[PDB]
Every structure is written in structure tokens, then in C-alpha cells.
């Protein structure tokens, strides 16, 4: 329910005695947290808005040379001085050209030439600063329960839904608590400042399009710039990059400027992050977030309820949600009130033993109206199983066959953990961790390797990183020595680091 | 004259019985040809007008996306379709998105999404094709004689100038004859097809800027193009090189056009030539010719004249023309009429012996007025010398010292002809050729290695040429064999091929 259609949902179950579980709540992923006694809730980070942008370098990427002039003197008679050479809104270049009797001079030799061109910028790039005391992460939550199919993307009006809530966790209030009426209150304890390392990033703006440009890339590209937010006629130091001073003949000197390099920088942003701007606040469309989840105040609505009595009905026949879950929606025809649907998985009809785990604890009909739609989600076993719901002989059953194997899921979870460890690195030890001497020492021994990899192999791009991965595969399959394991860890360390993209 | 101020003017000697000499007319250089008993002519190519350019493929370098749409389809329910991918001017890509019960569908899985976007171009690059049967070179000639310094580049009037003449050299009429009244007619026999390999170049056009660009470069840059022969709504083949389709993760595919690539191609030429155009015909500023100078019928003006009486006065001081030569401009005072200036260079003034090559043969004042300005050209020997421009005791003697030496001139002209052989390659063996069994064998051995070097070492923009040169120093110092030369002969031959560029 808001987590059922996403491909990258991960299931985090098992706590430190039931107190808390530590999740790395990503922006494109969704997270389903479940216990044996507690209602499972699907928690998804939806936005990351960066507020209150300060201005740093604002480059000029399409310039225009206005009024010019020049002055030349004969050789061995000094160099030229034009009145707009000590002006800093003009760009100026001196050179030595051939000057002889044909030019007007009276001595053959190299003359002296000065060409001044008024630098006038048309439209400029602007690089805003994104600093960690301005973030306001919206994390939507939604508990599994008395809800139907039209409450998955249905978001218009949620403060009066009792099941779903937004918890805007800013680092100005790094811990929050959501009142899930009836279900208790899910408490979050995020670390919004230790997110995507936002002290080392800016928020570039070009032709009303916005990015998250890395800090090292933004302070080195050679293009005409000024200092801050002075939006008048700036100083534009380093104006030589776009203007071009070639050689003057007796009657030709083209000081043409280079054209609009918006396209030259769209082609240079090969690693940036497409953000969007809704005014002064920047809605980012990416980001991982740390969050410890306290659930000891989150309890089951309707555990005391009596079982259902009569007249189920399959509307919207079951379907498989890309992981092995089977979303079955029912329509309970009956006014016995707040009852509990007895749904399970049965291999043998007249054994009715529960064979498949059920992902949404105590599914409950809530409305006292006659035809109440309601949604489940079931985790069948590998193979064949029936969706036995209702009690007695008026039951409504359904055959399901989920194809797969146990060894296939453990490989699909090794791939899910390797892509999590390639995106996060050290943080991937804090996604299903309840703390310990094994799930928190491995990350401390991994932050050292992560610092000796971000600094050692730097940030090499995809192709050259493959080009040095295959070279370390080949150094692995030779160099016959007692340390045969010498250089075969930056091969899986480089391929899985990007072959899993 | 027309040549006395240029830095790389060359002085050529030696004829096949006086009938002809062979030269390669550099476009930035000038050539002074002198014979035994006939006037020295200054020969310069000044323009190269290319008429009748028929255009080819014409790129777009900044696009604009009009109205958008996108359609999705459930898993295993087909593939999506709009009305607008059946229109050739809209760009469209099919991709897979997650669909579920939240997104209205009925089966969970990867859907199908088609995103159409109306391509509209507003800025164009234009490739014009040029064939050698449309070249229009121009050779301005100007002999040394009755000229004053305000007639060096005074191209205002040459059909009655009696000393200066244009010769239009074209593929249709390559041989030409320049009528110089009194001097006869210098016959030229150029070959304009074997100029600057002009059948493998184009003529770009970008915001009223023109270039010479290699055919192979223009047929390789990946930008949305229509074929150029379409003068309506263009087709724009390969539109997908300016638009970018990105799936965020979910049922959302954005389309964003990349920016104006104008500065990306100003920075991507960097090896092209600049060019203007004065109509439909594009005047170039670079190239050369292969020009035979049929000097046989060029006769000397005013040999039978009387000699000058007296009263020569300087108008301005002699100056040294960067080559050791010194130009001296006198003013004859008197009305004897068309007489001959009696000037020569004196070492040991007491005997008054001529010592240096007086460049301007038959120095003749033609106009009979009282004060007539006149120009001479001198080559003093290496050292102290005197410039006598008269007869009797009223002669003019100017002390001249030329700073230099004989072995310094021989190494400056060995490097000067090695830069000339590096710029031209094959043709620089026919810059002063008289037709020999060695100057035409050294040419065949240089054209063979030049074709076995331009095909072996392809395009390398100086930096890789130095990298591979320095790379061949260590491989010419090792691998003891007879081919340690063959890796060191193409060591100096490649880095110095790039040094003086």
C-alpha cells in the first residue's frame, strides 16, 4: 500500500527485541517494516527540498563583444595606450605586428597593437550553495490495514485518513513522531545532515534548469565569472576564455567571441543530478536518508476484533508485485462491523495449514457499510497455494502459483545487497541493522576501505574504471607469487561497483 | 614593392637559360624573382575567391521541444502508441515503467511508455561543397622600377599602372600572361587544381562565420541534420542527438533538449581555417599555388636612357628590411627626364667598387618633373659599407652597418627552408626548382615518404606528435638493431615537424 508497485522495495523485518530498526530510507526506494506483533508500515522518502540558496560563482556562458577600438605606433617608438585599456569592463590585448614603409612607418620591424573589446555578458550561469541547515525531507508513511485499491497513489487529503502521514524531518528537528490514529505513533529519528554529503555540493542553474553540481567540478571550469550575487553589471574576471585575439593584418582583425556554451556544459554535466525548482526552494529528486525507527508506540488496530462471518467477493483478481507477493483485494458484503478477515495460504484444502507468511498483520474490515472494499498482501511459498479467505463453507478461495526457488531468492538478495552496497558503501550496513558486534564492526572496517577507495581510485568514470578493472583482472590471473590474492579485490571491487548500475 | 614589408619574402635565383623558374606561391608569403639582365618582379597571391558553392548536409545546433505527450500500457497488454510517432518530425522512444494497482492498471509489472516530443530547429550549420573547377586565385605582380614608397600596396589603379598587374589564375585558364607596359609580359603557367587539396574540404556557415573544414570532419559530427537539398520543413535525420529521454524510476519519462552546441563546435574546430565571403563566393586567406614563371620574354625598361646628372636628395632614412637588405628612397631634383639613378654599394670608398647585389635592376626615374621621388633596393655585404646614389662630388654616401654574418644567414635559411618543407612537404621542393636530376629525384623520394607518413601517422594535433616523438627517442635508443635509425629517423622528422608550427 504505496509500496506495492515499486520495483526497489526492500523488506526489513526483525528488531532488537522489538524496540527499533535502522533503515536507510532512499528516495526512489520504498521500505516495508514488519514485526511479528506490530502493523507493517511502508515508508518512502518522497522529496528533499533545499531552501534559502546563497549565490557563489555565476559564470557567463554566452558573451557579446560590443564597441571596440585600437591604436598602433611605428616600431622602436613605444607601445600603444588607448583610453579604455585601464578600464576593467573592456578586455584588451597587446601584440607585435609587421610594420614597414607600406604601413606608414619609417622603420621596418614589429610594431605595437592594442585591441580593446567591450565585454558585455548576455545570460549567465548561477551557482547556488546548498548547506545542511536548510533541508526539509518529506517522508511519507502508510500502514497496511483497512484500505482498498484506491488508496495507493491517492494522496489528496491525508491529515484526515488515520492511516497515512507525512513527517517532515528537518535537521532543525532531527527527530519526529507521526500520530497514526488507532495504530499508535511511528517515531522516526533520522540523521538528515549525514545524507548525501551536501557540504560538498552546489545547485547550478542554467537556462532555468537546475542541477546538483559537485564542488570540485564547479570551481574549476574555465569560463568568465564574477564573485557573488551582484546582479548588476559584474566585474567578470577571466574574460579571456570567450574572446579571441588572433593576428591583425593591415585591414583585418577578427576579435570574434566564442558562442553560447550552454550545450558545451550540458555535455560536461555527465554526472550531475537533475533537480527541480518551485520558486526559491529546490525540490531534489534524489537522496538517501538514515532513519532509526522506534515502534514501541506502534501497535495493532483491531487485534481484539471478532472474525468475519459471511460473503466475501474477489474484485480486482490477485496479481504478483514483482517480488513474490500476491496483492488480493476483497469486497466484504456484511454489516457485522469491525471484524477480521481470515486469510491464509493453504496447500491442502482440508488441512488449511498456514504455509505462507502473511505480510499485512490482522487485516481488518473497518466500515459498517455493506460492501466494504479491503486490500491484503500475502507472501506465498514457492510453488502452489490457495488464498483461503473467510471461514466455514461459504469461503472464497483462489489458486496461486508463484514460480521461483529459495536459492533464487538468496541470489536476488545478494544482488539487492550488492547494489545497495555500491550506492551507499558503508551506509549499507545500516539498512537492516539492529546493532551488534558484527553488523556494526563490518561497517567500521568498511569505512576505512571506503576512504582508501574514494581517495585511492578517486572517482574514475564508468569506461576508464572498466578499463582498469579488466587490467586488474589480468594482473590477477598472472603475477605468480605467494600472495596470489594480491590484486584481485579491486576487480570485484570495481566491476560490481559499476557493473551493477 | 608590394613585397618589401613582408617578413617571409624569398629571393630566388637561377633559370633554365633565363626562360622560366618554378615557385610555390605561399598565401602569406611573397616572392622576389631576379635574373641576370631583366627587372626584379614581386609576385603575390592575394585572394582565392571560390564561386558556385552548392550546399550539402546542414546541421541544427540548437533545438526546441514543442508540445509533449506520453502513453503507458499494462504489462503483457501490448506496446504503447500515440498518433504522433507516426509523424516524422516528433522524437519518440519506447521504454518500460512500473505499473500497478495504484497506477490504474490491473497487473503488476513493467509497463510500456512512449514519449513523443515535437522537434523544432532554429539555428543551422551549413556545409557547402567546393570543387576545384570553381577556384579563382589572384596573383598581383609589381616590378621594381620607377616607384615611390607610397606605391607599395597602393592597389588603387593597376590597369594603367605600367608596373602592376593582376593575373586571374583559374582551372579553366591556368596559363596566363601579365602585360607590363615596357617590361613586356611575364608569362605564368600555374596549376590551380593541385592547390590545397581543395576537393577534400567544405565551407561552414554559422551565424555569419565561415570556415574551411575537412570533409572527413564534417561527415562525422553527430548532430541532427537534414540533407540540405530540402528547402521546406526539414526532416532532421538523427534528431535523438539533441534530445535526452530519461526515466526517473517510475511512470515518468522526461524529455529535455541539450543546449546550443555553437560553442561546442567553436571549441571543436580548433584546427579549421577562417573565411569570409563577399556574396555567393567565399574568399579564403590561405593556400598556395604551383607557378611557373616564364621569364624568357620579360625585357628591361630604359637601358638606352641617359644617366642622371645630379641633385639626388633623401626623403627619408634607409631602413633594413629584416633580411639584410636595406631600402633607400631618393628624390631626383632636375629635368633631364627619363634617366637612370647611378647607385651602387662601396667598400673601400676610395676606389668605389660595386660589392653587393643591387636588387632593383635598371633604377629609372621616368617622370621629368623637378622633384620626383624614387625607391631603390640594396643587398650590402656583411659589414661596413656605403650607399652611393650619384656621380661626381655631389654624390650621396650613407654609412651602413648590417648586423649579421654568413654562417648565421646559412643556418637561418636552412631552418627557413625546413619550415617551408614542413608546411608544404612535397611542393616545397619546387619553390626554386629549375628542373634537375636531383631536385626532381629528391622530390620523388620526399613525396613517397610523405604519402607513407600521412597514411601511417594520421591526424595528430601536435600534442600526440610530441608524445610519440619523445616516445620514439627511448625506442631508438634501445632494441639494438639496424632499425634503431628507422625509429630515430622518424623521431626528429616528427617532433620538429610539430615544433615549428
Amino acid at each position, epitope marked *: 500500500i504505496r509500496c506495492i508497485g515499486v520495483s526497489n522495495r526492500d523488506f526489513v523485518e526483525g528488531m532488537s527485541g522489538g524496540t527499533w530498526v535502522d533503515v536507510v530510507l532512499e528516495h526512489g526506494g520504498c521500505v516495508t517494516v514488519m514485526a511479528q506483533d506490530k502493523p507493517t508500515v511502508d515508508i518512502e522518502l518522497v522529496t528533499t527540498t533545499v531552501s534559502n540558496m546563497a549565490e557563489v560563482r555565476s559564470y557567463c556562458y554566452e558573451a557579446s563583444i560590443s564597441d571596440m577600438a585600437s*591604436d*598602433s*605606433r611605428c616600431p622602436t617608438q613605444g607601445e600603444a595606450y588607448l583610453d579604455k585599456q585601464s578600464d576593467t569592463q573592456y578586455v584588451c590585448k597587446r601584440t607585435l605586428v609587421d610594420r614597414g614603409w607600406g*604601413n606608414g612607418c619609417g622603420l621596418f620591424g614589429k610594431g605595437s597593437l592594442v585591441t580593446c573589446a567591450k565585454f558585455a555578458c548576455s545570460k549567465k550561469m548561477t551557482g547556488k550553495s546548498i548547506q545542511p541547515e536548510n533541508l526539509e525531507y518529506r517522508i511519507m508513511l502508510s500502514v497496511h490495514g483497512s484500505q482498498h485499491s484506491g488508496m495507493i497513489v491517492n494522496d489528496t487529503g491525508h491529515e484526515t485518513d488515520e492511516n497515512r502521514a507525512k513527517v517532515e524531518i528537518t535537521p532543525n528537528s532531527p527527530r519526529a513522531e507521526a500520530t497514526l490514529g488507532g495504530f499508535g505513533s511511528l517515531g522516526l529519528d533520522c540523521e538528515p545532515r549525514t545524507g548525501l554529503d551536501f557540504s560538498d555540493l552546489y545547485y547550478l542553474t542554467m537556462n532555468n534548469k537546475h542541477w546538483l553540481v559537485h564542488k570540485e567540478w564547479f570551481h574549476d571550469i574555465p569560463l568568465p565569472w564574477h564573485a557573488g550575487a551582484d546582479t548588476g553589471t559584474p566585474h567578470w574576471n577571466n574574460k579571456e576564455a570567450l574572446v579571441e585575439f588572433k593576428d591583425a593584418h593591415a*585591414k583585418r582583425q577578427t576579435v570574434v567571441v566564442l558562442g553560447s556554451q550552454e550545450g558545451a556544459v550540458h555535455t560536461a554535466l555527465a554526472g550531475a543530478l537533475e533537480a527541480e525548482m518551485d520558486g526559491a526552494k529546490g525540490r531534489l529528486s534524489s537522496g538517501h536518508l538514515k532513519c532509526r525507527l522506534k515502534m514501541d508506540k506502534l501497535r495493532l488496530k483491531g487485534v481484539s476484533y471478532s472474525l468475519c462471518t459471511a460473503a466475501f467477493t474477489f474484485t480486482k483478481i490477485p496479481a504478483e508485485t514483482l517480488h513474490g507477493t500476491v496483492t488480493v483485494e476483497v469486497q466484504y458484503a456484511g454489516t457485522d462491523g469491525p471484524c477480521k478477515v481470515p486469510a491464509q495460504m493453504a496447500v491442502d484444502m482440508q488441512t488449511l495449514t498456514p504455509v505462507g507468511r502473511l505480510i499485512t498483520a490482522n487485516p481488518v474490515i473497518t466500515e459498517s457499510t455493506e460492501n466494504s472494499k479491503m486490500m491484503l498482501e500475502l507472501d506465498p511459498p514457492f510453488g502452489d497455494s490457495y488464498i483461503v479467505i473467510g471461514v466455514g463453507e461459504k469461503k472464497i478461495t483462489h489458486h496461486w502459483h508463484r514460480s521461483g526457488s529459495t536459492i533464487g531468492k538468496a541470489f536476488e538478495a545478494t544482488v539487492r545487497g550488492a547494489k545497495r552496497m555500491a550506492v551507499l558503501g558503508d551506509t549499507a550496513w545500516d539498512f537492516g541493522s539492529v546493532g551488534g558486534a558484527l553488523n556494526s564492526l563490518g561497517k567500521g572496517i568498511h569505512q576505512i576501505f571506503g576512504a582508501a577507495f574514494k581517495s585511492l581510485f578517486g572517482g574514475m568514470s564508468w569506461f576508464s574504471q572498466i578499463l582498469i578493472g579488466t587490467l586488474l583482472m589480468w594482473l590477477g590471473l598472472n603475477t605468480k607469487n605467494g600472495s596470489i590474492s594480491l590484486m584481485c579485490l579491486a576487480l570485484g571491487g570495481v566491476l560490481i561497483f559499476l557493473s551493477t548500475a | 614593392i608590394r613585397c618589401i614589408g613582408v617578413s617571409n619574402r624569398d629571393f630566388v635565383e637561377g633559370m633554365s637559360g633565363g626562360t622560366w623558374v618554378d615557385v610555390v606561391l605561399e598565401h602569406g608569403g611573397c616572392v622576389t624573382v631576379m635574373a641576370q639582365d631583366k627587372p626584379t618582379v614581386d609576385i603575390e597571391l592575394v585572394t582565392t575567391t571560390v564561386s558556385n558553392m552548392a550546399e550539402v548536409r546542414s546541421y541544427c545546433y540548437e533545438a526546441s521541444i514543442s508540445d509533449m505527450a506520453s502513453d503507458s500500457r499494462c504489462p503483457t497488454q501490448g506496446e504503447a502508441y500515440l498518433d504522433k510517432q507516426s509523424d516524422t518530425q516528433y522524437v519518440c522512444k519506447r521504454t518500460l515503467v512500473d505499473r500497478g494497482w495504484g497506477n490504474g492498471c490491473g497487473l503488476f509489472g513493467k509497463g510500456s511508455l512512449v514519449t513523443c516530443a515535437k522537434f523544432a530547429c532554429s539555428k543551422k550549420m551549413t556545409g557547402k561543397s567546393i570543387q576545384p573547377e570553381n577556384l579563382e586565385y589572384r596573383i598581383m605582380l609589381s616590378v621594381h622600377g620607377s616607384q615611390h614608397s607610397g606605391m607599395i600596396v597602393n592597389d*588603387t589603379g593597376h590597369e594603367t599602372d605600367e608596373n602592376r598587374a593582376k593575373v586571374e589564375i583559374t582551372p579553366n585558364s591556368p596559363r596566363a600572361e601579365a602585360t607590363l607596359g615596357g617590361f613586356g609580359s611575364l608569362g605564368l603557367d600555374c596549376e590551380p587544381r593541385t592547390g590545397l587539396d581543395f576537393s577534400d574540404l567544405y565551407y561552414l556557415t554559422m551565424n555569419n562565420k565561415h570556415w574551411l573544414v575537412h570533409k572527413e570532419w564534417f561527415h562525422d559530427i553527430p548532430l541532427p541534420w537534414h540533407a540540405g537539398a530540402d528547402t521546406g520543413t526539414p526532416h532532421w535525420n538523427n534528431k535523438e542527438a539533441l534530445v535526452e529521454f530519461k526515466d526517473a524510476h517510475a511512470k515518468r519519462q522526461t524529455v529535455v533538449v541539450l543546449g546550443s552546441q555553437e560553442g561546442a563546435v567553436h571549441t571543436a574546430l580548433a584546427g579549421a581555417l577562417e573565411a569570409e565571403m*563577399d556574396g555567393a563566393k567565399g574568399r579564403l586567406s590561405s593556400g598556395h599555388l604551383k607557378c611557373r614563371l616564364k621569364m624568357d620574354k620579360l625585357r628591361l625598361k630604359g637601358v638606352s636612357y641617359s644617366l642622371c646628372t645630379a641633385a639626388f636628395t633623401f626623403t627619408k632614412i634607409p631602413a633594413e628590411t629584416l633580411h639584410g637588405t636595406v631600402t633607400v628612397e631618393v628624390q631626383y631634383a632636375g629635368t633631364d627626364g627619363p634617366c637612370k639613378v647611378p647607385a651602387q654599394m662601396a667598400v673601400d670608398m676610395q676606389t668605389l667598387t660595386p660589392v653587393g647585389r643591387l636588387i632593383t635592376a635598371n633604377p629609372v626615374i621616368t617622370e621629368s618633373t623637378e622633384n620626383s621621388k624614387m625607391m631603390l633596393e640594396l643587398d650590402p655585404p656583411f659589414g661596413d659599407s656605403y650607399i652611393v646614389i650619384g656621380v661626381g662630388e655631389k654624390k650621396i654616401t650613407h654609412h651602413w652597418h648590417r648586423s649579421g654574418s654568413t654562417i648565421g644567414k646559412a643556418f637561418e635559411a636552412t631552418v627557413r627552408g625546413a619550415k617551408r618543407m614542413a608546411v608544404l612537404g612535397d611542393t616545397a621542393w619546387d619553390f626554386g626548382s629549375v628542373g634537375g636530376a636531383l631536385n626532381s629525384l629528391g622530390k620523388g623520394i620526399h613525396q613517397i615518404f610523405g604519402a607513407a607518413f600521412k597514411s601511417l601517422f594520421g591526424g595528430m594535433s601536435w600534442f600526440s606528435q610530441i608524445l610519440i616523438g619523445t616516445l620514439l627517442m627511448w625506442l631508438g635508443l634501445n632494441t639494438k638493431n639496424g632499425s634503431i635509425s628507422l625509429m630515430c629517423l622518424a623521431l626528429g622528422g616528427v617532433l620538429i615537424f610539430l615544433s615549428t608550427a
Partner: antibody, heavy 127, light 110 residues
Framework: VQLVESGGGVVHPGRSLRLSCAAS????????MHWVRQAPGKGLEWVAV????????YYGDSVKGRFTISRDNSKNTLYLQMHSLRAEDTAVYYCAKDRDAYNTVGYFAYYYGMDVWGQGTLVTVSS | QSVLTQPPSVSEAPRQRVTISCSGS????????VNWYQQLPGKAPKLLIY???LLPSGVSDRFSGSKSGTSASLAISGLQSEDEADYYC???????????FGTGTKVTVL
């Protein structure tokens, strides 16, 4: 850029007559000058140019050697004197500034042509 | 030639392009750049295009210049109800060493 002429007069052919003009703000020594004539009922006709020093000083082939243009650097003022002056040369006069310096006039003087004028005052040479 | 003839008067409908064709010779136009000038009804002239295709600051972008051989075609596009003024060509000829003006080009809006 603020330039104004002065020195009109009505004089019969063959005596002295002068005009003058000046400006400020920018530098006057490192710029050139040129005096322009404009007969009513006609367009404009050029008169003379002065370099940034005065050595190079060129007059048009209409009234060569007959009008004398005078100024130099350290005065910030332009003059124009005329004596033994032709009869129907009466016209408005203009003090425009060719935006260059004319150390050479046609070689490395790419950007010639004058920026900003002022509405001057004409003279009258008639009976 | 030092006369520099060019058409006296031109009448073009508004919002279309107007050409001014100058045919000098290689004395002035055919070797170095050409200038072009704007003299107001009452006020004094100003320059419009120096170096034959450039625009000084302070003038509308309606104008544009060109210089092909001895064909100087100047272009005022989108003629409106204000430029009822005269237009002048000018170039330096270096042999006769003069700054030759033009004859005159008046346009009327209609």
C-alpha cells in the same frame, strides 16, 4: 561625449574667420578629430582630419591648403581658421571625433568613423 | 572616384526591409571598411555601422551592414514612423587620401 561647436560669422570672401569646440570626461589627447562641412540644400562634405598629435594632418582635395585646423593635446580645445576663403563654401560645420588616433590613417585604423557630434553653427560667405 | 553615388530616395512599406546600395570602387570600399550615418531631421548626424557590419552602443538593432567588393548594401529592417531622416555613406580612400561622404539617402514612412 558632450561636444558643442561655436564661432559662427557672416564674412565676405577674403578675410579671416574662426570656429572652435571642446569636450571632456574621456581623454582628448589619445583621440583624433575631424572637421566636417555641410551646405544647406546638400548633404555633407568632408573637410579635414587631425591625429592624436597633429603631425599626421590631412585635408580634402576640395579646399587643400586653404583652411587651417589647429589644436594639440594639452589644451582640450579644437580650432578652425579660414582666410582668403572661397565664396559659396558657406555651410554648417561639425566637430566629429573619428574614434581612432591616426598614427597611421589607413593601416591599422580598422575602426575609423566618428562617434558623437553636436549641433553646430554655420557661417555665411556672400554679398 | 571620390563621389560615391547611391540612390537618392527610397519609399518602403512599414515592417519590411529597406536596402541602401553604395557603389564606390576599390579605392575606398574595395580595400578597407565602410561606414554609414544617420542625420536627424533637426538634430545632427550620428554613426550607425562602423567597420561595415558593427553596431555602436546606443542604436537599435534594426540595422545591419555589408560590404561585398564595391557593393555596400546597408539594411534597415522594419521601417517605422520615426526614421524620416537622411542616411549617409562614408569611406577613407588611401590613394587620394580623403574621407569621402555619400550623396544622401532620404526615406519616407508609408
Amino acid at each position: 561625449v558632450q561636444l558643442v561647436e561655436s564661432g559662427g560669422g557672416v564674412v565676405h570672401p577674403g578675410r579671416s574667420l574662426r570656429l572652435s569646440c571642446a569636450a571632456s570626461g574621456f581623454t582628448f589627447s589619445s583621440s583624433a578629430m575631424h572637421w566636417v562641412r555641410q551646405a544647406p540644400g546638400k548633404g555633407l562634405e568632408w573637410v579635414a582630419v587631425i591625429s592624436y598629435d597633429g603631425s599626421n594632418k590631412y585635408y580634402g582635395d576640395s579646399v587643400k591648403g586653404r583652411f587651417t585646423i589647429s589644436r594639440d593635446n594639452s589644451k582640450n580645445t579644437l580650432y578652425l581658421q579660414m582666410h582668403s576663403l572661397r565664396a559659396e563654401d558657406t555651410a554648417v560645420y561639425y566637430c566629429a571625433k573619428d574614434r581612432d588616433a591616426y598614427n597611421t590613417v589607413g593601416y591599422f585604423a580598422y575602426y575609423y568613423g566618428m562617434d558623437v557630434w553636436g549641433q553646430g553653427t554655420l557661417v555665411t560667405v556672400s554679398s | 572616384q571620390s563621389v560615391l553615388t547611391q540612390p537618392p530616395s527610397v519609399s518602403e512599406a512599414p515592417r519590411q526591409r529597406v536596402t541602401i546600395s553604395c557603389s564606390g570602387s576599390s579605392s575606398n570600399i574595395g580595400n578597407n571598411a565602410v561606414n554609414w550615418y544617420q542625420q536627424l531631421p533637426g538634430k545632427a548626424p550620428k554613426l550607425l555601422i562602423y567597420y561595415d557590419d558593427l553596431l555602436p552602443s546606443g542604436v537599435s538593432d534594426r540595422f545591419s551592414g555589408s560590404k561585398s567588393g564595391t557593393s555596400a548594401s546597408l539594411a534597415i529592417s522594419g521601417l517605422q514612423s520615426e526614421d524620416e531622416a537622411d542616411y549617409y555613406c562614408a569611406a577613407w580612400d588611401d590613394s587620394l587620401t580623403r574621407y569621402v561622404f555619400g550623396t544622401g539617402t532620404k526615406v519616407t514612412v508609408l
